[PDB]
DNA sequence: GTCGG
DNA sequence: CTGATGCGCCT
DNA sequence: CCGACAGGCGCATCAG
């Protein structure tokens, strides 16, 4: 990676600020800088050169000079050796343990996977599953496996009702060679912004995926969002595939393009795009794009017939899913 | 931590 | 019980 | 120099 040291440095700082400082805006600032530097097509030679980039300011440029000069960052060296910091940071890696729970656990002497296992009874349901599959959830998923997973989900949804449409989004739709999880966007004609004409639309898919042993655990489930765990079937005498995270979002059919835009990401692309919408006087969520009135409140949903219409409203040249990465 | 007005 | 708030998750 | 920073689902907790 061209400026890999720098963007690694920045990501670690973002994680510190998020996990340890609980400073969500410093976290976003560091990630924004990381992103802008990652896409910069020259080897950064100094902090002043990085300072020209939007999102990089005085403090980051200084750290960059230190990093370029010395190969390291004293502030991060101090963070790496601080037991409390590393422990809070480590615990947030379990799905369902965020910054607050991690600090509580560490304050109560819980600092290791070992400790979490002994105190399973202190963990909520999500956290217990996140602990169960700790090692598996940190493995990435080759695209080849994403393809078989896609094949399972789409065939099984089609067996529940031919009128469902399932689309795999996240990094998969962006053309990534590996993914962290599987993101499935689901629509059905009976569920639009005007009417839900059949209940259980999501539940029935989740249940069908449970019946064939594809979905193995449930982290959370409501009427429009499912978060859980799935697993590819393996063959005779083969090692099992790791268990994988799967998120299924049921979106109103008439709001598919806002939904697919949201679910295709990247997360940073969405934050940039939504922030650009605000500068142009709009707000975008997974459902709609709406104008912002003087007061600052959102008016009625604009018409949308493609992902591109959304870009057009905010005066951006279309970006294909593959170009929304990093 | 950064930045637009 | 309702309604509010905040966590941790997702892109 | 100082607010604004993206937006929201499901869950857990809390006041009443
Ligand atoms: Cl360092
Ligand atoms: Cl909306
Ligand atoms: Mg700059
Ligand atoms: Mg976590
Ligand atoms: Mg994903
Ligand atoms: Mg996901
Ligand atoms: Mg992600
Ligand atoms: Mg929050």
Structure solved via:
X-ray
Q: Which tokens sit at A55?
A: 């999102």
Per-residue CB contacts under 7 A with strand D, chain A residues 113-152: 124-126
**Looking at residue A132, which CATH number applies to its domain?**
1.10.150.20
Please tell me whether residues A242 and A313 are part of one structural domain: no
The dihedral region occupied by A258, where left means phi > 0, alpha psi between -120 and 50, and beta the remainder, is alpha
Scan for tokens 């940039």, then name that residue.
A272
> Is the separation of the CB atoms in A240 and A232 below 8 Å?
no
Q: Which domain holds residue A88?
A: 83-139
- Interacting residues of A227 by C-beta distance below 8 A, sequence separation 6+: A126, A218, A219, A220, A221, A245, A246, A247
Please tell me whether residues A77 and A89 are part of one structural domain: no
- Interacting residues of A242 by C-beta distance below 8 A, sequence separation 6+: A133, A135, A136, A139, A231
Domain count, chain A: 4
Which helix (DSSP H) or strand (DSSP E) does residue A245 occupy?
strand A244-250
Which nucleotides in chain B lie less than 7 Å from some protein C-beta?
1-4
Please identify, among A262, A284, A301, the residue that sits at the C-terminal boundary of a domain.
A262
**Residue A63 a catalytic site member:** yes
Please tell me whether residues A111 and A211 are part of one structural domain: no
Answer for A196: CB within 7 Å of strand D: no
For chain A, what's the residue count? Answer: 326
- Interacting residues of A252 by C-beta distance below 8 A, sequence separation 6+: A187, A191, A192, A193, A259, A287
DSSP-based three-state secondary structure for A215:
strand
Q: Which of A164, A159, A209 is nearest to A182 (CA)?
A: A209
DSSP state of A123: S
Q: Which ligand is nearest to the CA of A126?
A: 4
Please identify, among A96, A113, A139, the residue that sits at the C-terminal boundary of a domain.
A139
Which nucleotides in chain D lie less than 7 Å from some protein C-beta?
4-13
């Amino acid at each position: 990676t061209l400026n890999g040291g720098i963007t690694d440095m920045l990501t670690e700082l973002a994680n510190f600020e998020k996990n340890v400082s609980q400073a969500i805006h410093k976290y976003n600032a560091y990630r924004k800088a990381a992103s802008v530097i990652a896409k910069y097509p020259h080897k950064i030679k100094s902090g002043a050169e990085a300072k020209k980039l939007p999102g990089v300011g005085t403090k980051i440029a200084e750290k960059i000079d230190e990093f370029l000069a010395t190969g390291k960052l004293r502030k991060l060296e101090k963070i790496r050796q601080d037991d409390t910091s590393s422990s809070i940071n480590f615990l947030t890696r379990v799905s369902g343990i965020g910054p607050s729970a991690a600090r509580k656990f560490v304050d109560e002497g819980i600092k290791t996977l070992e400790d979490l296992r002994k105190n399973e009874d202190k963990l909520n349901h999500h956290q217990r599953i996140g602990l169960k599959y700790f090692g598996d959830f940190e493995k990435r998923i080759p695209r080849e496996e994403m393809l078989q997973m896609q094949d399972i989900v789409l065939n099984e949804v089609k067996k529940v009702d031919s009128e469902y449409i399932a689309t795999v989004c996240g990094s998969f739709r962006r053309g990534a060679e590996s993914s962290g999880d599987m993101d499935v966007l689901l629509t059905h004609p009976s569920f639009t912004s005007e009417s839900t004409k059949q209940p259980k639309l999501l539940h029935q898919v989740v249940e069908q995926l449970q019946k064939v042993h594809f979905i193995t655990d449930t982290l959370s489930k409501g009427e429009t969002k499912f978060m859980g765990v799935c697993q590819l079937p393996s063959k005779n005498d083969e090692k099992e595939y790791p268990h994988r995270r799967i998120d299924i979002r049921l979106i109103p059919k008439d709001q598919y393009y806002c939904g697919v835009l949201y679910f295709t990401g990247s997360d940073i692309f969405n934050k940039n795009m939504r922030a650009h919408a605000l500068e142009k006087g709009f707000t975008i969520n997974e459902y709609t794009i709406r104008p912002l009135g003087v007061t600052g409140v959102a008016g009625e949903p604009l018409p949308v017939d493609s992902e591109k219409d959304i870009f057009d409203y905010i005066q951006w040249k279309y970006r294909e899913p593959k170009d929304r990465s990093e």
